[PDB]
Amino acid sequence: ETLVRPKPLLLKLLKSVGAQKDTYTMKEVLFYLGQYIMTKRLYDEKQQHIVYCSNDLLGDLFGVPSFSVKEHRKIYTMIYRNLVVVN
Numbered sequence: 120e121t122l123v124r125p126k127p128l129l130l131k132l133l134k135s136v137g138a139q140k141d142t143y144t145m146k147e148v149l150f151y152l153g154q155y156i157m158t159k160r161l162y163d164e165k166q167q168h169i170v171y172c173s174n175d176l177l178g179d180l181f182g183v184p185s186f187s188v189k190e191h192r193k194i195y196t197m198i199y200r201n202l203v204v205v206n
């Protein structure tokens with residue numbers, strides 16, 4: 120497990136979909152990010168590997184207008200900018 124403390128804006132995003140903690144496992148961060156994308160319908164209905172976020176907090180956090188879920192390394196990099204790893 121990787122324990123992480125989200126920075127304030129990522130924390131706000133996580134709490135908007137029901138998160139309760141100040142530190143998380145990475146698995147939990149990915150869970151809540153997926154739930155956020157689903158509930159706000161940011162994914163492309165006609166190609167559900169694509170996420171559009173140019174008009175959303177997520178686009179500010181990741182620094183991109185859109186991304187493909189297949190870009191695993193890049194998405195991890197975007198998430199890790201928004202947290203600090205703790206032990």
Ligand SMILES: [Cl-]
Pocket residue numbers: 120121122144145146147
């Ligand atoms: Cl983890």
Ligand SMILES: [Cl-]
Pocket residue numbers: 126127128129
């Ligand atoms: Cl922040």
Ligand SMILES: [Cl-]
Pocket residue numbers: 131132135176
């Ligand atoms: Cl929000």
Ligand SMILES: [Cl-]
Pocket residue numbers: 137138139140
């Ligand atoms: Cl939680």
Ligand SMILES: [Cl-]
Pocket residue numbers: 149150153
């Ligand atoms: Cl998940």
Ligand SMILES: [Cl-]
Pocket residue numbers: 189190191192193
């Ligand atoms: Cl990759």
Ligand SMILES: [Cl-]
Pocket residue numbers: 202203204
């Ligand atoms: Cl770190």
